[PDB]
Each structure stands twice: as C-alpha cells, then as structure tokens.
Amino acid sequence: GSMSEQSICQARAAVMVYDDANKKWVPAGGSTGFSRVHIYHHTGNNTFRVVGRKIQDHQVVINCAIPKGLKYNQATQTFHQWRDARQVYGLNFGSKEDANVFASAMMHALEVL
Ligand SMILES: CC(=O)N[C@@H](Cc1ccccc1Cl)C(=O)N1CCC[C@]12C=C[C@@H]1CC[C@@H](C(=O)N3CC[C@@H]4C=C[C@H]5CC[C@@H](C(N)=O)N5C(=O)[C@H]43)N1C2=O
Ligand SMILES: CC(=O)N[C@@H](Cc1ccccc1Cl)C(=O)N1CCC[C@]12C=C[C@@H]1CC[C@@H](C(=O)N3CC[C@@H]4C=C[C@H]5CC[C@@H](C(N)=O)N5C(=O)[C@H]43)N1C2=O
Numbered sequence: 323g324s325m326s327e328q329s330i331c332q333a334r335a336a337v338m339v340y341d342d343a344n345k346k347w348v349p350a351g352g353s354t355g356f357s358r359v360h361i362y363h364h365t366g367n368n369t370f371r372v373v374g375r376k377i378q379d380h381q382v383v384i385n386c387a388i389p390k391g392l393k394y395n396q397a398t399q400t401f402h403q404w405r406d407a408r409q410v411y412g413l414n415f416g417s418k419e420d421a422n423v424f425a426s427a428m429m430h431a432l433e434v435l
Pocket of ligand 2: 394410
C-alpha cells in the first residue's frame with residue numbers, strides 16, 4: 323500500500339471469528355495460530371483498519387475497517403472482541419501486555435476518528 327497508511331500498533335494474537343450458526347469460536351482463515359495484528363491509520367481520510375497475518379506463513383486472516391463509533395469489548399484480560407455486520411472478531415492475545423497495548427491504541431483511534 324501507500325506510505326500515507328501507517329501502522330500505529332502491532333500485537334501478537336490468535337484471530338478468531340464467531341460461527342453464528344454453530345455457536346462456537348473458530349480460527350480466522352481456518353487454522354488456529356498466532357498472527358501479527360496491526361492497527362493501520364490511513365492519514366489521508368483519517369480512517370483505521372485492523373490487519374492480521376499468521377506469523378508462521380503470513381496468511382492474511384483479518385482485514386477489517388474500524389469505523390467511527392465501533393464498540394470494542396475487553397471480555398477478559400487476554401481476549402478482546404468487536405463486531406461488524408459480517409462477523410464478530412475475537413483476539414486471543416499472546417500476553418496481557420499485547421492485549422493492553424492493542425486496546426489502548428484502539429481506544430486512541432476511536433477518539434481520533
Ligand atoms: C508490515 C507492514 O505494514 N510493513 C510496511 C511498513 C511500512 C513502511 C513504510 C511506510 C509505512 C509502513 Cl506501515 C511495508 O514494509 N510496506 C511495504 C510497502 C507496502 C507497505 C507499506 C505501507 C502499507 C500500509 C498498508 C500495508 C499493506 O499494504 N498491507 C498490510 C498487509 C496487507 C495484506 C495484503 C495486501 C493485499 C493487497 C492489499 C489489501 N489487503 O487490499 N494488502 C495490504 O494492504 C497489505 N503496507 C505495506 O505493507
Ligand atoms: C452485544 C454484543 O455484541 N455482545 C457480544 C460481545 C460484545 C460485547 C460488546 C461489544 C462488542 C461485542 Cl462483540 C457477545 O456477547 N457475543 C458475540 C460473540 C458471541 C457472544 C454472545 C454470547 C456468548 C456468551 C459467551 C460470550 C463468549 O463467547 N465469551 C465470553 C468471553 C469468553 C472468552 C474467550 C473465548 C475463548 C473462546 C471461547 C471459549 N471457549 O471460552 N470464548 C468465549 O466463549 C468468550 N459470548 C459472546 O461473546
């Protein structure tokens with residue numbers, strides 16, 4: 323992408339989505355494992371997105387917009403979640419620091435938007 327989109331946070335987390343029909347969390351992209359998850363700020367239009375890529379093979383497993391007003395829920399000290407119309411996303415962070423720094427960056431983003 324272009325240089326006007328910049329990463330403002332990176333954390334290690336396993337990305338899950340909620341299978342609405344089976345009432346179970348499943349790995350984003352089909353295989354359980356940790357990803358490197360960034361919050362990218364596109365400075366041109368002041369928008370944000372989350373993109374995560376598996377660490378072991380760089381599969382892109384999440385690429386989702388963070389709109390104004392998004393509700394970000396810290397369900398546990400290492401599992402955080404949010405929605406869009408298509409999926410509920412969950413991040414199982416690799417450590418409490420990963421979770422807390424990612425959440426702080428998300429909250430700062432929600433205030434910038
Ligand atoms: C891990 C990471 O950011 N690395 C950046 C670091 C960077 C360097 C300089 C300035 C800003 C940044 Cl940050 C990077 O090396 N460089 C190489 C040039 C492309 C990129 C620099 C900026 C942009 C920000 C968006 C990100 C990017 O381009 N990304 C993030 C991963 C995502 C995955 C797949 C492909 C599919 C086509 C398109 C899509 N999904 O529609 N797409 C992406 O959008 C991918 N950039 C990059 O990698
Ligand atoms: C109003 C709303 O939008 N509520 C959402 C959560 C949310 C709140 C606020 C803002 C954004 C979101 Cl998105 C909700 O309750 N939604 C979405 C996913 C399905 C679920 C609804 C019901 C179940 C109750 C149990 C909870 C849940 O799913 N939980 C509770 C926390 C618990 C912790 C970790 C992960 C690990 C994998 C799995 C496990 N095997 O332990 N697991 C969980 O089970 C986690 N539900 C949910 O979150």
